[PDB]
Amino acid sequence: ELLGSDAPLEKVCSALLEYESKRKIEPVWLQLATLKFIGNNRKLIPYKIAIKNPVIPSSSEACLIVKDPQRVYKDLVNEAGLSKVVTRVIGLSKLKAKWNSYEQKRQLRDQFDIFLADDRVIPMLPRILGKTFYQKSKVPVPVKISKGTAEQLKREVVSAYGATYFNSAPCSSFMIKCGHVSNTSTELAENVESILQFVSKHIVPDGAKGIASIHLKTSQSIAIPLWNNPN
Amino acid sequence: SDKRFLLLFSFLKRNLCASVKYMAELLNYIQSQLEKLVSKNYYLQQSAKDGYRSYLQAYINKLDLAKVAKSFGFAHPPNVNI
Amino acid sequence: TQVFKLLNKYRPETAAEKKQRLVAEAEAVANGKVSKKPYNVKYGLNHVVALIEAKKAKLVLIASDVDPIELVVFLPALCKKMGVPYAIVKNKARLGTVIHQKTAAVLAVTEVREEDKNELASIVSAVDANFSAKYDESRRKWGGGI
Amino acid sequence: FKRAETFINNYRQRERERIRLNRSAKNKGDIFVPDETKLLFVIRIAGVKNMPPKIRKVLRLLRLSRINNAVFVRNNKAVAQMLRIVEPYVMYGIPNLHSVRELIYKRGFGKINGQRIALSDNALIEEALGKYDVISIEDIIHEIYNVGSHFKEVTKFLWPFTLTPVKHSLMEKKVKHFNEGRKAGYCGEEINELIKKQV
Amino acid sequence: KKKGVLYVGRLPHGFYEKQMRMYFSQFGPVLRLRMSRNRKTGSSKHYAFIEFESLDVANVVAETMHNYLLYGKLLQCKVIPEDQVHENMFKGADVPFKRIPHATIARLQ
Amino acid sequence: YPDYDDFFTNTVRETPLSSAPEPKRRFAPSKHEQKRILQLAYAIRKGRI
RNA sequence: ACAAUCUUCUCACAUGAGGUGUUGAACGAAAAUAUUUAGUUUGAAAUCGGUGAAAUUUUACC
Numbered sequence: 099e100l101l102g103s104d105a106p107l108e109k110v111c112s113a114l115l116e117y118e119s120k121r122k123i124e125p126v127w128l129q130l131a132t133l134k135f136i137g138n139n140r141k142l143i144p145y146k147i148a149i150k151n152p153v154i155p156s157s158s159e160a161c162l163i164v165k166d167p168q169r170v171y172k173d174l175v176n177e178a179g180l181s182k183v184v185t186r187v188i189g190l191s192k193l194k195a196k197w198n199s200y201e202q203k204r205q206l207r208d209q210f211d212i213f214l215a216d217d218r219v220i221p222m223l224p225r226i227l228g229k230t231f232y233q234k235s236k237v238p239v240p241v242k243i244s245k246g247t248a249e250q251l252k253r254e255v256v257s258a259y260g261a262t263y264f265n266s267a268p269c270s271s272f273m274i275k276c277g278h279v280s281n282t283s284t285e286l287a288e289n290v291e292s293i294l295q296f297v298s299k300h301i302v303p304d305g306a307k308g309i310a311s312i313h314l315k316t317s318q319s320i321a322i323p324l325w326n327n328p329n
Numbered sequence: 330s331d332k333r334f335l336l337l338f339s340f341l342k343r344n345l346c347a348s349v350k351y352m353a354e355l356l357n358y359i360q361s362q363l364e365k366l367v368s369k370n371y372y373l374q375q376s377a378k379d380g381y382r383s384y385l386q387a388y389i390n391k392l393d394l395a396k397v398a399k400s401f402g403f404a405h406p407p408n409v410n411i
Numbered sequence: 412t413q414v415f416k417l418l419n420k421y422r423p424e425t426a427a428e429k430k431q432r433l434v435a436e437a438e439a440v441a442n443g444k445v446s447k448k449p450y451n452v453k454y455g456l457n458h459v460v461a462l463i464e465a466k467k468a469k470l471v472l473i474a475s476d477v478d479p480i481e482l483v484v485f486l487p488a489l490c491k492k493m494g495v496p497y498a499i500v501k502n503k504a505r506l507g508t509v510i511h512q513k514t515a516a517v518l519a520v521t522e523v524r525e526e527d528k529n530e531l532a533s534i535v536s537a538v539d540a541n542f543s544a545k546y547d548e549s550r551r552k553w554g555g556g557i
Numbered sequence: 558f559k560r561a562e563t564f565i566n567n568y569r570q571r572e573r574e575r576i577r578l579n580r581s582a583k584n585k586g587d588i589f590v591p592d593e594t595k596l597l598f599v600i601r602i603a604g605v606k607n608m609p610p611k612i613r614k615v616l617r618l619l620r621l622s623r624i625n626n627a628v629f630v631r632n633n634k635a636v637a638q639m640l641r642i643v644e645p646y647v648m649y650g651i652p653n654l655h656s657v658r659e660l661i662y663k664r665g666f667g668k669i670n671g672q673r674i675a676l677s678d679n680a681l682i683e684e685a686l687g688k689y690d691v692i693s694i695e696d697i698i699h700e701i702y703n704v705g706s707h708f709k710e711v712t713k714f715l716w717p718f719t720l721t722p723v724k725h726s727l728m729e730k731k732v733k734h735f736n737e738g739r740k741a742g743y744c745g746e747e748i749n750e751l752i753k754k755q756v
Numbered sequence: 757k758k759k760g761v762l763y764v765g766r767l768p769h770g771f772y773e774k775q776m777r778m779y780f781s782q783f784g785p786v787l788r789l790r791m792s793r794n795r796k797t798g799s800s801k802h803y804a805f806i807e808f809e810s811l812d813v814a815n816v817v818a819e820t821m822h823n824y825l826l827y828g829k830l831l832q833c834k835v836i837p838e839d840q841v842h843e844n845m846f847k848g849a850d851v852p853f854k855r856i857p858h859a860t861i862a863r864l865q
Numbered sequence: 866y867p868d869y870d871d872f873f874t875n876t877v878r879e880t881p882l883s884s885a886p887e888p889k890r891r892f893a894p895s896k897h898e899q900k901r902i903l904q905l906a907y908a909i910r911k912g913r914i
Numbered sequence: 915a916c917a918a919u920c921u922u923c924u925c926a927c928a929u930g931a932g933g934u935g936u937u938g939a940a941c942g943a944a945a946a947u948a949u950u951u952a953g954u955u956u957g958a959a960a961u962c963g964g965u966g967a968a969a970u971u972u973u974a975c976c
Contacts, residue, residue: 129946135863165922190922195526200958218923224935225920232936268859271946317952321945371892395879405466408884413825433898437905445894464882494877530828537825551869562916564775565768565827577919645919734915763961773974801938803960827916842962852974862949
């Protein structure tokens with residue numbers, strides 16, 4: 099309805115799920131085209147797109163890079179009991195020094211699943227990580243833990259787990275992860291609508307008017323157009 | 330031969346005499362990271378060195394000893410007798 | 412100079428520093444009151460020769476001009492035997508200043524912090540390529556006769 | 558000779574300097590504008606071989622064509638911006654009246670007819686600065702500290718000072734690249750103490 | 757006499773076309789120098805080919821800077837015999853490489 | 866003056882030469898500095914240092 | 915002088931708007947349309963592959 103005064107969703111999402119099952123998890127990515135450049139340059143920061151149905155599995159291990167000292171955050175993780183999810187916390191200084199080489203950085207990357215970062219540390223994270231991390235489909239996210247409280251960290255971790263991750267770069271079209279094939283069609287449609295609202299709100303400069311084409315597909319599927327701009 | 334423990338560590342995580350004691354000591358405490366902790370822990374190192382003594386003695390010229398020690402979590406094969 | 416650039420990070424604390432530090436703990440105990448392993452460079456002939464045999468040494472640097480050459484003449488063979496990358500650095504007085512002594516017959520790097528673990532690995536491959544890859548065969552020819 | 562390392566070090570500095578300029582100019586057109594002083598004091602700590610073209614011109618625009626030169630600047634939006642551009646090369650602060658007094662009275666140098674001329678006679682000051690109501694050395698210091706109408710003319714006449722680092726004790730004459738530990742950036746009134754040591 | 761051509765590998769980040777020229781010049785005059793770079797963004801490929809007037813001068817460097825630990829990198833340089841030298845290792849040599857801003861020109865277009 | 870012959874060192878010996886275990890000295894904080902520290906505290910208490 | 919300033923946060927008001935930075939090489943995904951773009955392997959590996967600012971040419975991230 100926001101896009102073109104109509105919402106041809108749900109039925110398209112259900113059909114895509116049936117087609118994927120027939121063509122026998124594969125991620126669900128929505129292809130969006132804009133009439134103008136979304137960004138003037140590459141923006142190496144996450145887009146905290148909160149959705150009802152998360153795309154990050156709950157079994158994924160998380161590493162939360164924090165500002166120094168690491169002991170304060172490490173004590174906080176112990177107090178909050180998030181050690182089941184927060185696998186390892188590394189200070190910013192110890193991140194710069196301990197892991198320097200391309201080989202060491204690669205292992206320190208593959209040793210986890212999701213690498214969350216503090217709000218005050220996400221800026222310098224562009225370096226001290228290298229193209230090994232920032233380009234091999236593992237970008238940090240800006241988890242807000244500046245309050246320094248167990249509840250604040252627990253709330254941020256829950257929100258980060260339940261939110262999608264996107265990183266805009268200077269182009270006209272981009273793909274955003276919407277879910278998995280195993281996810282329910284209704285849940286995927288709700289997530290797709292939520293991302294669309296976020297896309298028009300803080301991504302597309304012209305909102306739904308700036309959005310030219312919208313299509314959905316899997317990693318290897320065909321981008322079936324969900325809706326098109328009538329004007 | 331140098332990745333026997335790694336396969337068991339991964340499989341156990343996915344599906345979560347002295348040699349049996351050595352496995353439990355590391356599992357409770359938990360490749361270079363594994364080799365670092367043992368070489369930095371006194372009680373754990375004694376168990377690990379004992380574990381290699383039992384396994385090599387239990388099993389002679391066919392096994393790659395250096396890879397066997399890496400399986401337990403030591404940098405180099407210890408000076409075990411037989 | 413690259414070898415000694417690293418070595419001069421792991422210089423053992425002087426007898427001046429070893430006291431000024433230990434007084435700080437003493438006053439902390441005397442009023443009201445634990446650490447990490449001290450990282451430095453291993454020196455001394457008996458101590459180092461033991462380390463190679465115990466395979467605790469990552470890199471051995473042998474003073475080139477020890478006066479009774481009996482002391483180090485067996486070292487390159489032993490370090491080759493245990494597979495410890497070694498080099499024969501020029502002059503003992505250079506190795507002496509690293510440890511705050513007049514002279515050192517032999518140094519050895521046994522373990523460095525993770526921060527400099529990459530630098531040591533880079534140096535070790537250089538000593539392999541510049542010292543042992545080169546020469547090697549020339550080490551098996553009778554010197555002199557010029 | 559020149560080793561292959563120094564060629565690297567120049568490049569690393571040049572890209573390090575160049576990236577700093579982009580972040581300083583773009584997205585950071587904001588200056589904190591040191592307040593409560595119309596007059597600042599700026600000296601050049603060090604320069605980098607194969608200078609960036611931008612800094613090379615700007616330093617000349619501030620008359621700091623050579624190292625260890627000392628120049629007064631009237632505080633304003635424009636001057637502080639150029640100082641912010643060349644910040645990693647200059648130590649700047651707020652001189653006190655006394656510190657400015659000894660600078661002129663011990664290291665003040667004039668530019669009479671365009672040669673390196675010491676401010677040895679008050680007649681020369683009156684001769685070259687009479688029409689701007691500047692007659693004496695004491696007129697110079699009063700004008701400079703007060704930054705009057707003739708402040709621009711006086712600063713044009715003044716030759717930059719040379720605060721070469723002093724080497725007296727035995728430790729200084731031996732430590733390599735000794736510059737009294739001169740950092741780069743804002744130093745508040747520490748520049749006064751540095752001048753007191755230097756003059 | 758005989759045109760010596762030299763390869764240098766494992767270039768530390770920085771040892772670029774100008775830095776090599778002002779270094780190898782004191783060894784001897786350098787005529788045509790190219791350093792391989794990325795087609796898209798002009799980023800360094802970290803290996804360059806240089807030419808020397810004589811192979812004897814060309815082999816001079818190959819026995820000094822070979823395995824030259826530089827910034828943690830072991831410089832790899834040795835003489836490449838002329839039988840297999842191609843025509844244009846120096847196509848565009850000594851010329852400031854053109855990196856075109858593909859993204860911005862697309863947005864303007 | 867024949868060329869040097871290495872009839873023993875041509876191979877690399879994987880095991881450490883000594884079999885004895887690592888005494889707990891090399892894992893616990895130094896006892897020798899403890900004598901020095903406690904003697905240092907005593908002088909401070911008794912007013913010698 | 916293998917040393918140097920790649921940011922341990924800002925603005926408006928709990929919220930919003932920002933932060934400009936990524937070693938190379940190889941196998942590979944089809945889509946939105948020369949930019950993004952699944953999954954991968956590696957020693958920071960390697961051996962041809964439009965625009966000015968200065969004295970016609972000089973730029974080595976413009």
